[PDB]
Amino acid sequence: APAILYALLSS
Amino acid sequence: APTLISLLEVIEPEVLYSGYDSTLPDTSTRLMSTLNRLGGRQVVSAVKWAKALPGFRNLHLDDQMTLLQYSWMSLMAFSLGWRSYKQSNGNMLCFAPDLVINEERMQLPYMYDQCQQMLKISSEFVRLQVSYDEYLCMKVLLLLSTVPKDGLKSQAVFDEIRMTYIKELGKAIVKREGNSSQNWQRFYQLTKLLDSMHEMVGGLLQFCFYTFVNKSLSVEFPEMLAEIISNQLPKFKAGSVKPLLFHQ
Ligand SMILES: CC1(C)O[C@@H]2C[C@H]3[C@@H]4CCC5=CC(=O)C=C[C@]5(C)[C@@]4(F)[C@@H](O)C[C@]3(C)[C@]2(C(=O)CO)O1
Numbered sequence A: 001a002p003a004i005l006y007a008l009l010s011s
Numbered sequence B: 001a002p003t004l005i006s007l008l009e010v011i012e013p014e015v016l017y018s019g020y021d022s023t024l025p026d027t028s029t030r031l032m033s034t035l036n037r038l039g040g041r042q043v044v045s046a047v048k049w050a051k052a053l054p055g056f057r058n059l060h061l062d063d064q065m066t067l068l069q070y071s072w073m074s075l076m077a078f079s080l081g082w083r084s085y086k087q088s089n090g091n092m093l094c095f096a097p098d099l100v101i102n103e104e105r106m107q108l109p110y111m112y113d114q115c116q117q118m119l120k121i122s123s124e125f126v127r128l129q130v131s132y133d134e135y136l137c138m139k140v141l142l143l144l145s146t147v148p149k150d151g152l153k154s155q156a157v158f159d160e161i162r163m164t165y166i167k168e169l170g171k172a173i174v175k176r177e178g179n180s181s182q183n184w185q186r187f188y189q190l191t192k193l194l195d196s197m198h199e200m201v202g203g204l205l206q207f208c209f210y211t212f213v214n215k216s217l218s219v220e221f222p223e224m225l226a227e228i229i230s231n232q233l234p235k236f237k238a239g240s241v242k243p244l245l246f247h248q
Helices: A003-009 B004-010 B028-052 B061-088 B112-128 B132-143 B155-174 B180-213 B223-237
Strands: B093-096 B099-101 B146-148 B241-243
Touching: A003 B028, A003 B061, A003 B223, B004 B132, B004 B155, B028 B061, B028 B093, B028 B099, B028 B223, B061 B093, B061 B112, B061 B132, B061 B146, B061 B180, B061 B223, B093 B112, B112 B180, B132 B155, B132 B180, B155 B180, B180 B223
Parallel strands: none
Antiparallel strands: B093 B099, B146 B241
């Protein structure tokens, strides 16, 4: 999974 | 109180600047690299925007990531089309206030074909005289227009949120003070524009992948886009991405 995108969505 | 449309207006991302240095002549490499950096920042803002959409965070996290991952190019190109429609009536591509691409600057390697495809998006706003509220509703539907062939983890939630914003687009149409027959034809024309985005965005994505895989072109990508592109790439060539069409 794209880390930056996931970090944004899970705060 | 508040109306859904009023909420979409206040969460719309502010336009970002490119910082492009036009002191010296343009090059296809420097221009594409600057646009990708700008694009990565706009996608971050798009994630912030999507998280504030009513209903979106009711989806499974994996579904939130899939939708944004499958539709980021269509969101960016649709917003570019809108900015170009309001700034130059579709005559120039307004990537950013400090980076406007007129018909001359498009005459660069790798630039012309893709920029003509994006002008065609802006010209559709012109032909149809799209309103801001119509545009905001259509842009949410783009986020909800590309899904995996095997479906989402929370399909029930997804189906209902998509209908919520289909109805909201209708409300935006009714605001134009038309009768029933006119509002249905208007809805038909706008859902046709949404369907056409899949093909017009296809060529933009195919070319984005091309510049990303062939490192010889020296095109720079931000980490945000690099991660998304590389994870998105094997899914397309495998044929597991299905668009959602209003008309077959
Ligand atoms: C050759 C050209 C013009 O077409 C391709 C599609 C372009 C995108 C179209 C939509 C958009 C709207 C903007 O406001 C800012 C950035 C982008 C995302 C974008 F511009 C840049 O992200 C650069 C892209 C990939 C692209 C590349 O593939 C470069 O690698 O450049």
